[PDB]
Symmetry: C5
Subunit: 311 residues, 5 copies
């Protein structure tokens, strides 16, 4: 229980590897996701070297307490990881082969600007603090990085689980720290978004536009205002249950634009009636007639503009 | 505390068995369910063999620390299982009989495509990682698999708890892994759906269809739009409180179709009025007259089509 | 640390007793409840007997580790109970007197068929698995079963805390099990239900029935449909927040019947108008006049029928 | 690790004291509140007496394991308290000075009858069970009982933290129990109630009363019914999120009375119209004229009656 | 062990420093936030002094058990912090350099008076209780206080992480206490508030004001009342999900004022109609004409007054 000594001035290279067993509980609101994975660590400790002939065994198994193990920690975890040592094995030269199974709630931010057509890169940061006697540097064993084929996130297509092989070495509180980046690339698999959210919302908006084919101010007030209540009630029904996002999203803009369309529709209805009351049914009829094309066209173009702006 | 040695080159067969005591907290949203069960393990360690004459005892009881126990883990659990060793018993030949009581929150995906007439297969995966000295393989003792008769999940019929006797042996990180599949088959209790959800949502839709027996555009706008609000408010009332499902479900389609029916009903109402204003009460009356049969018939057929498509 | 030996062939009788200190968090939805209680165990271990004269002491206090204690477990608990040994005391003849303080989230199903006029029987099942050497049977010490007078569940009258003195001995995985049933009888506090839920729901229904005193189809459509929205919004306001119950409840039936009454009221309104439009104000007036008595009477009788059926 | 022996037949007096560091998470629904506090215990165990000359030290510090500490427990806590021993100090005479820092979710019932003008007395019950060798009695050290000035509960004024100095010694399961009552007196902060809840609810109700200045049955149906929906939606907006209270509260009564006022207003509207249709516009006008004063006056009086009844 | 001895009469100075690694789960409702940070402690224990020449080593590493470490605690944490000792290092003069990684749910009150244009100062209070042998005082090592650049709280700009260098030394239960204040200054990201909350809420209000351009009492009742329902439904849609704030906020006032504006708008509508019915269309027209400017102007000024009052 002291770090291994350097042959020359070299730092201790710890070979890492994360193998995802299970990925679950991705909370879009909290920006967290839970993982069940294997963490494999490998380093050279000469104090533990042995001759396979005079020992008989080709590999020696140790208990965590018995030998020096580097203090590897996760940077972005909520509570400290729940680890269980699976195996520790020493090869004749002194190469330790550590493997543990852990579960962790990882904090990784999410970008909803392009929701529900968004892709995310989830991060798992590995860190090691360099000791008094010698410096510790992390390295990636690509043979020890992967994920089980069964690894799923409902409503997401899991593209890849890879690691940024070059560690980000830096000084923190007068000591060296080696930081490794493991990336989980996921893209939204939301198909049912169209018939469940977009299409009913659009039907309600269209229902308001039928007031451009009526002259009954009482039926028109009922149309635009009652559809505005329906629109809001529908949005309470399909609510993301997430706090408001500080930035403007694609879907956020569309919804804003829809509120603006209900507003402008009321203006038209109000004008059409006022012109009729002021015995000017020529202007009242022309406005209503224009609105029949004006509303769908402006809506269609404004959506094309937004879609272009976000994607 | 070292694995038992092989007679010849054979792997160590560990006989498993899960006996469900309690099943609870099935979360449709989270795709999780909690379990209280017995995990019985049984293997042969010759180092432990005894003569009942020299020992006096017909069976020897050990403490977990005293003997070598295989590291059996669950694949799909959220946090590591809460285990309590009930009993460890060695028979004269060296056959170990381990039994522990555990509780675990198991992650198993759910298929809502046929909801609320759906059946689900809940999974409990047992795994063992092969050691340095020898390979470990899992096997099922069918006498040690079952469930208490009292075992219940409110709103589900618990059909069976069985295990896929042939383990899925595979290589992972240069070591053999032996995986076992325990399946909990449950089917839903869909009767209260009819009076609680289907019938009221239907009454609301029918209330809209009474606009095919009226010529009052003001009363008809009120009918279709106000029932559309009622429909949405009712759906907020019977809300599954689950995130939206990425795939299209049977119930999802019906609801979509209902929104489309409210849309088409507004088109009819609008047309009826426009033809009536444009002094064409022949076409206005004929359309309304058709709609009286057109709407119920198309609805009935479209539902028959969907029911056939999903089931 | 081995079970006590039998004088003859008799099984070991462990005398149990649960004393409720606190009862809390009764979750109607989850079908669980939390408890703080004392669990008192008493058995005869001769290996521990002593002469009070030679020992000069009445009773000898032991530490849990020092002596053999039977593995008593709860059948219906979520996580394993949080136990704290209060006292272990041996009398001269070897009668052990164990007492521990525990807290447990107990899973006990609930029957809402007669809600909110329901009574429930909460269960706490104690179990012991018989060992290799000898069989263990549970017994009830009635002097050690009770509850503190301060024991409360908000919204329930706590009737009794008693135990089914005869244990349910049965075989499980070729070993004997001794199961004891502790019952907590609670009845509901239904008074605030009348002014808070029943009466406003009834006022909303009556408001719709005023359409039987009007001939204005526009005012009548507004009446029945707007009260149908009010009814739903009120139900969202008084929502049980519980997943839907798979079975039909008393309150479930009443609400279903209310939805059917809103439906039939729309039929009347529609008919009355159609007959008036078809210049038949004799039938239109007679139907409306009947409905003024038909609706309250049928509602009153249909309730009487339901109340009789459930109680 | 055995209780201290009595000089004469006296019981062991343990001097207690709770000092609130932080109070938080007061859940009105759950009737629980969380606390961070110091629990100071002091008793004389002569077995621990030392000579300051032979020891060098004027006070000796011990580890919890090393000496006999009385088993002090909380009666009304959800899970067992999270304790951390801060200091254990013995002075030559054998006087032990224990101090711990604990956090606990305390269950104390709440009386909402006078909400939001209510005051509550939160309880923290300390208990000690007497042993075989000698009886243990709790006592209060008033110098060791208080609260930090920073101690806050959002929306409450924290009046006092005091203890009922006379313990409630009683027999339980043939052993003596000494109980101590610590009381946290809090009163509510109710000013934002008026503008946030009471006033908008009253504006909506007044909006309905404008139907006493109109003869349009269609505008009047819309007024009373649409305000009844608004009233309900507003109540969903300001919802306490608490299960229904089994007893009738002050606020509960006001809301009930408001529902009754919407009901009676519909009766007026219905009557006024029926009398007008039955060509009796003398009675129709007189009723409406009365209602203009009848409704505000009866409402004002009925509230005065209720306020008097509850306070 | 035992505290270090003083050279002269001086108190023991413990040099503290908190380095935020992760900040997450800021709950505006619960007035709590979670943190992952390093806690660095440093004091001089002469008992540990050594000669680097005689020792060979320039620094000695110890295990927590081996040496005296001061009991540093947090004042405002929910449960006791989850700590893991990273490193303990003694320099030849006996200066201990302790470093641990902890995670804690910190309770810090929030002031919503200026929401959503608010800034908050989150607190982390460090405390040490003075022992009998000697007094302990906390000090800040400014080189050891900071935050990772990646440290984020969604929807907030993290301004600074600093400590109030002068500790709050005070007496508590006849012992000295040294308190340090660590402050996390955050300001809100209010831009998405305008398009998401302020603008749609405003449109809904303007929709009501169109009743000043209509004489149809039926269309006007529908306008003001239906927009009042829309306003409430929209507020249920954008709900903070936070318990009501005991104090009056800026947004609280605006919303109250909006409810008052819906009320006054109904008064106008009612008056305009009553004057028209009482054949006084001169006053009816003049009021409506004034309201067209009166409502926007008074609203604009009243908002200017409020904005000035809060900011
Ligand atoms: C006036 C009447 C036809 C009406 C129109 C719009 C909305 C509602 C409800 C949702 C308040 C309504 O009752
Ligand atoms: Cl970690
Ligand atoms: Cl596991
Ligand atoms: Cl248990
Ligand atoms: Cl406790
Ligand atoms: Cl702490």
């Amino acid at each position: 229980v002291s770090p291994p000594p350097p042959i020359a001035d070299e730092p201790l290279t710890v070979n890492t590897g994360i193998y995802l067993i299970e990925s679950y509980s991705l909370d879009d609101c909290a920006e967290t996701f839970k993982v069940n994975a294997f963490l494999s660590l490998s380093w050279k400790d000469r104090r533990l070297a042995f001759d396979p002939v005079r020992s008989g065994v080709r590999v020696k198994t140790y208990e965590p307490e018995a030998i020096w193990i580097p203090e590897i920690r996760f940077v972005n975890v909520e509570n400290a990881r729940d680890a269980d040592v699976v195996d520790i094995s020493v090869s004749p030269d002194g190469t330790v082969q550590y493997l543990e199974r852990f579960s962790a709630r990882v904090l990784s931010p999410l970008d909803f600007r392009r929701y529900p057509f968004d892709s995310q890169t989830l991060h798992i940061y590995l860190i090691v603090r360099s000791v008094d006697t010698r410096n510790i540097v992390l390295a990636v064993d690509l043979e020890k990085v992967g994920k089980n084929d069964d690894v799923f996130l409902t409503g997401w297509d899991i593209e890849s689980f890879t690691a940024v092989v070059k560690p980000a070495n830096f000084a923190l509180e007068d000591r060296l720290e080696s930081k490794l980046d493991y990336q989980l690339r996921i893209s939204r698999q939301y198909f049912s978004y169209i018939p469940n959210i977009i299409l009913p919302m659009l039907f309600i908006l269209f229902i308001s536009w039928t007031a451009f084919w009526s002259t009954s101010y009482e039926a028109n007030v009922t149309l635009v205002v009652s559809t505005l209540i329906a629109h809001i009630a529908f949005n309470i029904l399909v609510e993301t249950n997430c706090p408001k996002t500080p930035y403007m999203t694609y879907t956020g803009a569309i919804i804003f634009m829809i509120y603006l369309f209900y507003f402008v529709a009321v203006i038209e209805v109000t004008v059409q009636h006022y012109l009729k009351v002021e015995s000017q049914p020529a202007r009242a009829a022309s406005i209503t007639r224009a609105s029949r094309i004006a509303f769908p066209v402006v809506f269609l173009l404004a959506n094309i503009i937004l879609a272009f702006l976000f994607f």
